[PDB]
Scaffold this active site. Structure first.
Site, short mmCIF file in Angstrom:
data_model
loop_
_atom_site.label_atom_id
_atom_site.label_comp_id
_atom_site.label_asym_id
_atom_site.label_seq_id
_atom_site.Cartn_x
_atom_site.Cartn_y
_atom_site.Cartn_z
N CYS A 134 0.91 -1.22 -0.01
CA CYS A 134 -0.02 -0.12 0.09
C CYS A 134 0.81 1.27 -0.07
O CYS A 134 0.10 2.55 -0.14
CB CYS A 134 -1.14 -0.25 1.10
SG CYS A 134 -0.32 -0.15 2.82
N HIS B 43 -1.59 0.85 7.38
CA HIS B 43 -1.53 0.83 5.78
C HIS B 43 -1.71 2.24 5.43
O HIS B 43 -2.26 3.18 6.31
CB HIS B 43 -2.62 -0.25 5.24
CG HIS B 43 -4.13 0.11 6.00
ND1 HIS B 43 -4.25 -0.64 7.19
CD2 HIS B 43 -5.22 0.48 5.58
CE1 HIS B 43 -5.62 -0.55 7.70
NE2 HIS B 43 -6.15 0.13 6.76
#
Ligand SMILES: [Zn+2]
Ligand SMILES: [Zn+2]
Ligand SMILES: [Zn+2]
Ligand SMILES: [Zn+2]
Ligand SMILES: [Zn+2]
Ligand SMILES: [Zn+2]
Ligand SMILES: [Zn+2]
Ligand SMILES: [Zn+2]
Ligand SMILES: [Zn+2]
Ligand SMILES: [Zn+2]
Ligand SMILES: [Zn+2]
Ligand SMILES: [Zn+2]
Ligand SMILES: [Zn+2]
Ligand SMILES: [Zn+2]
Lengths: 450, 41, 83, 90, 441, 88, 43, 90
Positions: free
Chosen positions: E146, E397
């Site tokens: 990510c 993330h």
């Protein structure tokens, strides 16, 4: 459905008239983009009738040089007094129809008038953006989590038959690609070199080249599927670097001398008997590279093997026996005809159900460190089967649900030490504790045969 | 008849209404292109 | 029950030395394993089976090339160097 | 009358029309107004099931003029008056 | 440890060295090629006592004798005749009967089958490393994506980049023409996939494979930084422009005509205000300290400020007089797209990593006029994209947000795309902010 | 508050143009040809002072959606200005 | 030695197999340790 | 007397020596004995700072004989019992 200015369509039935409109559209947009503020305000935003600047939008006539305001309706009057119904907003280049009382915003050739000279090609050889892609909105698909490969790979590189084979340079000696990013076996061989040999700086290149080679080969969850994938690639690459076309077939259909086939392949005997008369037709001998065992309601691996080598019943209707005409249900038994040097057992733990549903069986199954297969082999007379004992050298375990879900490898090394491989973390571990795991793949290497 | 305050407001009014009429033209035409190009939305 | 000797009738199967004089037959026996019987192997294993007896007994025996860095199996070492 | 344009011609040629005009777009953007008007337009297109400029204009335009802040309005007017008083006689 | 001196001795004579090696191999070979019964009767039968398996049984190295262990019958044989070396017939290992031990640590004896070539082996190969001998090593997980993906979304929704890609420049110029080999061709593919029609989003995977091969730090859960990937990616685009050219400086590539600004540090005369020295430093983003701040303009402020230098006493040409020079920083040149990093990560040399949680207020329209040098009109940028981190430093993330045409914001959380208000996008704790030039007065 | 004519000094400094109403906008074509690219709300001399000189500029980029077309053979998204080359 | 009963040789033959086996197992562990300890001084 | 070697000869020559030998190894393996004798040997090398065979063997062989499970002894001795009833006499 949405409509189009009939007047402008009316004009475009004529070819010349059409071209002329588009020249004027480009020229007005050109001027608006190539004009200093003061010359823009005085010559394109100054009403020809009231001489005011910015009495609302000012429109540039499409058919003479007149500019007329909106707020006092001077373009409207222009359109009524001389019939010039089209004009261009001098703030934005947008074409307005004073009979439709609205802008002509939905005609591609006008919007995109800079391509007027080549429209025939443009509108025949290219299409508008699809509705779904027009804004580029899409999630980005990664590789997924890679422990279902890690974990098989650890087992493969602590496998003595495979290590021996890798270390013999046989592939290296025969490969025609000779590079890791292109050939899969080259990449396997590189893992070995990083792990056991030397540099001449993370021991990770092999693995990365291998992940990559894998996906190039197969665009796309299951450790067991990856096991099957790896082993096919290995076989595929023995066949590829073989001298012939007669040998490609004999190796791919009858008998193969690759490392995969000379270490992981056994043969099942599937016997279909008539229970009335005893007709042994038909029975088949089919290879296998692993065995998939059922585990529902079982607590021990021997119970699983028992079930797999138990006499079933075939209810396949419209059946009668050959010699005796009994429609009675046919008995099937599965039995081992040839054992492999390395027996790979899979414990079916992932039920795939309909729609998207699924289920993980977390049942603990006792597995022994030494497993004896005599009871699962076929042939009154003393062809009573002698001890054939394998030793546990590797387990793959799974934790979590089926969808999300993590894998771990266990491997026994020389001297009978076990290590737990949790991606980058490699730790030592007692046999006692390894034997408590939830096995999903078990790896057994042949140890003693009497 | 005609003050500084007043003709100041004419000039501001002109600027505003021009600016509004420009924003609106870009929005209306744009939506009109979307509805013609794609029957379903 | 005290052993009174061999049944004479058994010494009827009977019919009859330096270890080095075994090379005669040895050179014409194929590879044997200490505890994987050759008949059971022939019978319950494939004719081309690879086998490594007691494979976790000692570590993998190999050596690493000074130039390549490649790990080499002993029987592989000389061919790597030679060509 | 008819000297409104005469005084606008002046401003344009002295460069102070650019200034007034730019300072106004600048304020309006930063106070969120441009965005409010765009959204008001989209909402009236929905409410009226129409994309016809004239129709939509007539409902948006008065609400967009009601929408400019006091500050922007007082400040810009002040600025206009200022540039005016340098060129008119009372 | 030490080695059997008795065998070391014998090895000084190199004809009798080749003798015991020849004999080791002969033996082992026999051991590996004898039927159980012949094995039992002729390698496990003791010569003195005639018993099979009276313990280990040893083939003498010098004669053909075989001696058991349990009745010290090989020990006796070595007493006199004097033959002190035996090979255990169970395992091939060599025993010295004066050492009372097995000779196990002489590589040549362990590896007797390479006898003939031994000196080339000793000098051209080495024994395994201590830490590699058993192949133990972790293998990393590559689902850490990510930090690369959130950046890509910002680039895929940046209008200067789309214009560049969809204008085909790189494609017309590339020599490699392959998305698996060339990084830039991989981006073009992502664009082809997201915006065009096909003939599975493989674009990202090709881009990953290109990436990890070029720099493997980009792989695994090593806590990699979205910012580092930014610099990495724009660098690759530049490197690709420089490679396709035929054959101080300022580059014409997409990266350098869109994202590059320049800072100016200068020494100014506090009297006549003229700059005496001026050093100009290009940049592709700006990094802003946020400790104790609460609003983006307070960060930009501390950035462009005046400093009384206490060690620069000098003579002004213009004045002309003696001055203690003021130092000031400020933007010399603004980029078409301004990229800001709010510094939230301390990856210390004392191992542990901290994230700053602070919410910082950022505007939809950002006016950079105060932070410019040398009376400066409004320069207003429009916020078109954000990259955010939530939550913990090691289990977190990165999420991207992007304004698309017409003003909708989207949240990209690989691979779930979702709609999102602006009033909420503004509530995020921003890590990267993307701004695009909107108004210049 | 005030009443208002226009200062006689300032009139003499510019005012009475006007040219004919029906040529007004066409009249600019000639000098437009000699004039470089202008943006509505990006002032030229400020771009020169504060931005790189070969800087790329798209005015009001999020105002309208991307203007592209997709190739019928390859399926590539093409900027309008790139289509014709792509095709030949 | 003990009086040669049938239970006597039987114990003797088992004994022989065990001891031969134990000694094989011990030989292989001592030699491995000795090779590792001299090859890698700092394990 | 002294024929024990000659019994052994006929066992080997009939093939029962093998049977005996293998049934024993198979039992010892599966019982875990082989591994306990390996681990015991490691324990002894370690606590005696030594890898001297003769010395470690002194310490290991006796505990390794004690460990053989009583069913392995009985079963295996019973098997040997029987192959002698065959060729030796009362
Ligand atoms: Zn008018
Ligand atoms: Zn007209
Ligand atoms: Zn019309
Ligand atoms: Zn290869
Ligand atoms: Zn094969
Ligand atoms: Zn039947
Ligand atoms: Zn080499
Ligand atoms: Zn001798
Ligand atoms: Zn003896
Ligand atoms: Zn010695
Ligand atoms: Zn390329
Ligand atoms: Zn560059
Ligand atoms: Zn000075
Ligand atoms: Zn094409």
């Amino acid at each position: 459905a949405m409509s189009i200015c009939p007047h402008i369509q009316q004009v475009f039935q004529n070819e010349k008239s059409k071209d002329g409109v588009l020249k004027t559209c480009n020229a007005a947009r050109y001027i608006l983009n190539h004009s200093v503020p003061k010359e823009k305000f005085l010559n394109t935003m100054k009403c020809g009738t009231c001489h005011e600047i910015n009495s609302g939008a000012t429109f540039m006539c499409l058919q003479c040089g007149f500019c007329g305001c909106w707020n006092h309706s001077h373009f409207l009057s222009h359109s009524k007094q001389i019939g010039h119904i089209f004009g261009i907003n001098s703030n934005n280049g947008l074409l307005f129809c004073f009979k439709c009382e609205d802008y002509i915003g939905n005609i591609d050739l006008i919007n995109d008038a800079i391509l007027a000279k080549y429209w025939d090609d443009v509108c025949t050889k290219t299409m508008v953006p699809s509705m779904e892609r027009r804004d580029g909105l899409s999630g980005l698909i990664n590789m997924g989590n890679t422990c279902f490969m890690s974990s098989i790979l650890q087992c493969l590189i602590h496998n003595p038959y495979f290590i021996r084979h890798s270390m013999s340079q046989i592939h290296s000696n025969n490969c025609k690609v000779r590079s890791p990013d292109k050939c899969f076996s080259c990449a396997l061989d590189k893992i070995v070199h990083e792990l056991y040999g030397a540099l001449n700086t993370n021991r990770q290149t092999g693995f990365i080249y291998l992940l990559t080679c894998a996906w190039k080969i197969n665009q796309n969850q299951d450790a067991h599927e990856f096991w099957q994938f790896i082993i096919n690639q290995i076989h595929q690459s023995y066949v590829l670097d073989l001298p012939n076309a007669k040998e490609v077939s004999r190796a791919n259909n009858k008998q193969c001398e690759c490392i995969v086939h000379t270490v992981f392949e056994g043969s099942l005997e599937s016997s279909i008997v008539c229970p009335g008369c005893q007709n042994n037709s038909k029975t088949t001998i089919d290879p296998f590279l692993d065995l998939s065992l059922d585990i529902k309601d079982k607590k021990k691996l021997y119970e699983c093997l028992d079930s797999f080598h138990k006499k079933e019943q075939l209810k396949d209707f419209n059946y009668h026996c050959g010699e005796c005409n009994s429609t009675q249900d046919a008995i099937k038994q599965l039995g081992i005809h040839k054992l492999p040097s390395v027996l790979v057992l899979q414990l079916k733990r992932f039920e795939h159900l309909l729609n998207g549903s699924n289920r993980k069986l977390d049942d603990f199954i006792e597995f022994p460190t030494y497993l004896n297969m005599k009871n699962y082999c076929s042939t009154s007379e003393n062809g009573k089967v002698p001890d054939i004992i394998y030793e546990l050298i590797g387990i793959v375990s799974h934790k979590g649900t089926v969808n999300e879900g993590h894998y771990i490898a266990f491997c026994k090394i020389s001297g009978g030490q076990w290590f737990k491989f949790n991606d980058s973390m490699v730790s030592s571990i007692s046999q006692e504790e390894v034997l408590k795991e939830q096995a999903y793949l078990l790896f057994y290497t042949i140890r003693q045969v009497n | 008849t005609i003050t500084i305050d007043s003709i100041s407001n004419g000039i501001l009014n002109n600027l505003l209404t021009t600016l509004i009429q420009d924003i609106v033209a870009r929005e209306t035409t744009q939506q009109q292109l979307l509805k013609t190009r794609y029957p379903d939305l | 029950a005290e052993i009174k000797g061999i049944k004479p009738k058994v010494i009827e199967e009977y019919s009859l030395d330096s270890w080095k004089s075994l090379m005669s037959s040895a050179k014409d026996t194929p590879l044997q394993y200490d505890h994987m019987n050759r008949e059971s192997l022939k019978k319950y294993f494939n004719p081309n089976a690879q086998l490594i007896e007691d494979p976790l007994d000692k570590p993998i025996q190999y050596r690493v090339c000074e130039k390549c860095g490649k790990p080499l199996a002993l029987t592989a070492i000389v061919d790597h160097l030679e060509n | 009358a008819q000297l409104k344009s005469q005084i606008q011609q002046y401003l344009v040629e002295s460069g102070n029309y650019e200034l007034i005009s730019n300072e106004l777009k600048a304020r309006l953007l930063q106070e969120g107004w441009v965005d409010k008007v765009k959204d008001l337009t989209k909402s009236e297109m929905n409410i009226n099931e129409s994309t016809n400029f004239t129709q939509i204009l007539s409902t948006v335009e008065p609400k967009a003029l009601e929408m400019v802040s006091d500050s922007t309005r007082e400040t810009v007017l002040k600025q206009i008056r200022e540039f005016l008083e340098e060129i008119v006689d009372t």
